[PDB]
């Protein structure tokens, strides 16, 4: 009967907690207590991109690290050349309320979706020269919150329907549905190997999914509110998570638990987006407060702040070359930052 | 700049021209969020105004003012994340099935949830107490009564400034304005005056509802600018 299963659930949760406490021999704060402080990272807005018309909800970098997709409530995707600030493409969306976009590792495609509960795959490199919808992925039964390409033909796609799905773009069908979540899946990050991904949800949990085996490899539950944001550490064996509670937390896959919690009492508002730098040494977190703070990911102290935005910083991204962090906000502007010594 | 850079900046300028045209479209368009449970008949309101997909954009126009009304639907039963998008709509329209008393309580709690939400602290709600004909019929049949569900309807008696329709019975007036007052108590409770609730009684036979929403948005924007000007 049900009571036996609910009890064995409690027992197995206790077993998991005991194994984690057994592994918790030392904190990251202790092991990194003697590593050098990174010091103040006075990043500067090298470019402001001014073309969007409403609240920007998402951006994603190309692997080329200069092209930059950006989605806004206006129902546009703009492809930006970050270097020149040029608008490479402006894509009229079939729905205004886009909430995620992705740029394919090839840059042949950009994905976006939102309250349409549909991801439109847009072919950037048509012979007809206009950008057009390559596929219109449907099967999600709720809003579409994040998507990331694995390949020109595969996209992983989280939804408020509490599921993530892997899609075969050439056939428009879900090749795997990930269904252990119990709340709106808000955030999604592919491992650099693309064989694993983490997805964070409003059940305050992050889950690690095997893309091809199809099952929850393990589950992370340290947060107190909705995990708005998630990002793998570039080693691919830890990931950061940003919540409605003002903390972000770094979970190690192999230690199966929080290494570190990034929080400061001056910060009382939700984290909106999270990205690591190429070394993983910086964790960059966007906030409801219009700042995005830079954290020492090892020591957990506020190495800096990017303060130029006039509204909620909705999305962060570091280039794959690491040369810059882009930052979109609800003020419709998209700022690219680096220091220059 | 290279010739190709010159042409790419030309392209960026041309896209900026198109984005400026869409800025004209987008600021002339007023966005509305059409909330309400499945009983509310909000789909009938959509149909009568127009004459697995997660959102339906009902475009309509009154006196050359364009309105886009987003009937959000086929979403899951937690709204608390996607309502963050509709910050900076001109209004939320919240259709209530006035007839469905047992679901009227969850409609009230859902109104409280919208009104109190940190992202909606400034977004006015146009209540459409729909199915007012079915409500009239139910009360004139008398088989089940508000008193079975809200005992304060003994203490409550019609406002001194209620204005019944000529064929409207005073008990229908009592039910109407009690439901209204129930919502208004929440609104006048939590509202700092950043945002106000504009109840209208309506039925499926209303052609006027586009005019209603036009007038309500006009009042919302006037009150908003006057608050900004410290005149209200």
């Amino acid at each position, epitope marked *: 009967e049900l009571d036996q299963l609910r009890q064995e659930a409690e027992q197995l949760k206790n077993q998991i907690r005991d194994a984690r406490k057994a592994c918790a021999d030392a904190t990251l704060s202790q092991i990194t207590n003697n590593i050098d402080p990174v010091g103040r990272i006075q990043m500067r807005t090298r470019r402001t991109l001014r073309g969007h018309l409403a609240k920007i909800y998402a951006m994603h970098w190309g692997t080329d690290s200069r092209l930059l997709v950006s989605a806004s409530q206006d129902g546009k995707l703009i492809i930006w050349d970050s*270097y020149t600030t*040029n608008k*490479v493409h402006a894509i009229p969306l079939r729905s205004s309320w886009v909430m995620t976009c992705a740029y394919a590792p090839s840059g042949n495609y950009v994905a976006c979706g939102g309250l349409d509960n549909i991801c439109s795959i847009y072919n950037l490199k048509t012979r*007809e020269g*206009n950008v057009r919808v390559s596929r219109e992925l449907a099967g999600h039964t709720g809003y579409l919150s994040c998507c990331r390409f694995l390949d020109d033909n595969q996209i992983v796609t989280s939804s408020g329907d509490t599921t993530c799905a892997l899609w075969d773009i050439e056939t428009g069908q879900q090749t795997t549905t990930f269904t252990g979540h119990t709340g709106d899946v808000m955030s999604l990050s592919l491992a650099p190997d693309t064989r694993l991904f983490v997805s964070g949800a409003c059940d305050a949990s992050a889950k690690l999914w095997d893309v091809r085996e199809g099952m929850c490899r393990q589950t992370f539950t340290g947060h107190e509110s909705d995990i708005n944001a998630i990002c793998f550490f570039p080693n691919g064996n830890a990931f950061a998570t940003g919540s409605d509670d003002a903390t972000c937390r770094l979970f190690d896959l192999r230690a199966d638990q929080e290494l570190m919690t990034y929080s400061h009492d001056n910060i009382i508002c939700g984290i909106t987006s999270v990205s690591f730098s190429k070394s993983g040494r910086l964790l960059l977190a966007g906030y409801d407060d219009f700042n995005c703070n830079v954290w020492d990911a090892l020591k957990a102290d506020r190495a800096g702040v990017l303060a130029g935005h006039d509204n909620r910083v909705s999305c962060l991204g570091v280039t794959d070359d690491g040369m810059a962090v882009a930052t979109g906000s609800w003020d419709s502007f998209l700022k690219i930052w680096n220091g220059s010594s | 700049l290279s010739a*190709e850079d010159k042409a790419a900046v030309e*392209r960026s300028k*041309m896209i900026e021209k198109q984005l400026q045209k869409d800025k004209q479209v987008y600021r002339a368009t007023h966005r509305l969020l059409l909330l309400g449970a499945d009983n509310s008949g909000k789909s009938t309101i959509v149909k009568q105004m127009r004459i697995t997909s997660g959102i339906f954009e009902t475009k309509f126009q009154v006196d050359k003012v364009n309105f886009h009304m987003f009937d959000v639907g086929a979403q899951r039963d937690e709204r608390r994340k996607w309502i963050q998008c509709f910050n900076d709509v001109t209004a939320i329209i919240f259709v209530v099935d006035s007839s469905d008393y047992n679901r009227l309580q969850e409609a009230l709690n859902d109104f409280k949830s919208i009104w109190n939400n940190r992202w909606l602290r400034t977004i006015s709600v146009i209540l459409f107490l729909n199915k007012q004909d079915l409500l009239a019929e139910k009360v004139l049949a008398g088989k089940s009564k508000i008193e079975d569900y809200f005992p304060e309807f003994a203490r409550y008696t019609t406002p001194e400034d209620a204005t019944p329709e000529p064929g409207e019975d005073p008990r229908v007036t009592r039910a109407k304005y009690f439901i209204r007052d129930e919502f208004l108590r929440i609104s006048t409770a939590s509202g700092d005056g950043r945002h106000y609730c504009y109840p209208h009684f309506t039925c499926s036979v209303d052609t006027e509802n586009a005019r209603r929403i036009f007038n309500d948005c006009r009042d919302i924007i006037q009150r908003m600018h006057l608050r900004q000007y410290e005149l209200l």
Partner: single-chain antibody
């Protein structure tokens, strides 16, 4: 995609003729358009350019006072109104689309051409012809009087192949970058001042005249072309 040029035939000297080109199946308004002409026995020569939205218009000095290029985007039709035509304007005139954004391949599609009979950086291709065999790993040299490496890092040498009965076709846009449709049997390399196309295994579809072209600055000159003879 089907650029089809119309007009042409004979004219008397001093005459006037309006060439046109219907764009057919592509987003013509978003492309810049070029006219390029080929004299009966000679290499390609750029004639005129009109941007998307007609903002930029550029001409070669051989036509600058004489030809006017215009476009009707609602019709998806390009025009070249020629005036004061002269014997040196006798050519096949190719309409050539171009699109300019990071990573774009301009000059990627060429129309069938219309023949008209009237009754700068220098690109040097010192090989007027090379005799070649199937499977041979042939290379085509090109040289420039100005370094085509711009400070933005691009090296604006394009390579075109004109097969004996066809229009030119883009092979390489920047000196490294192969076009989206072309065999990786082709490759390009260069120093900004000197350049090679390479064809690691020839086949009969590679027979033709190979033109290098600079897009560093207008007037956008082509080379004399290297013929490959099988």
């Amino acid at each position: 995609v089907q650029l089809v040029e119309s007009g042409g035939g004979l004219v008397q000297p001093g005459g006037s003729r309006k060439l046109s080109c219907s764009a057919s199946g592509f987003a013509f308004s978003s492309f810049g358009m070029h006219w390029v002409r080929q004299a009966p026995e000679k290499g390609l020569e750029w004639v005129a350019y009109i941007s998307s939205g007609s903002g930029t218009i550029y001409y070669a000095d051989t036509v600058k006072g004489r030809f006017t290029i215009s476009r009707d985007d609602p019709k998806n039709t390009l025009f070249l109104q020629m005036t004061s035509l002269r014997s040196e304007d006798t050519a096949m005139y190719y309409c050539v689309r171009s699109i300019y954004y990071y990573g774009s391949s301009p000059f990627d599609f060429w129309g069938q051409g219309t023949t008209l009979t009237v009754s700068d950086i220098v690109m040097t291709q010192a090989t007027s012809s090379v005799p070649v065999t199937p499977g041979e790993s042939v290379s085509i040299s090109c040289r420039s009087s100005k370094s085509l490496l711009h400070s933005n890092g691009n090296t604006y040498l394009y390579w075109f192949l004109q097969r004996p009965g066809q229009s030119p076709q883009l092979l390489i846009y920047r000196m490294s970058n192969l076009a989206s449709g072309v065999p990786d049997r082709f490759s390009g390399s260069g120093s900004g001042t000197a350049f090679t196309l390479t064809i690691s295994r020839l086949e009969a579809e590679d027979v033709g005249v190979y033109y290098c072209m600079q897009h560093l600055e207008y007037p956008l000159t082509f080379g004399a072309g290297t013929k490959l003879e099988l």
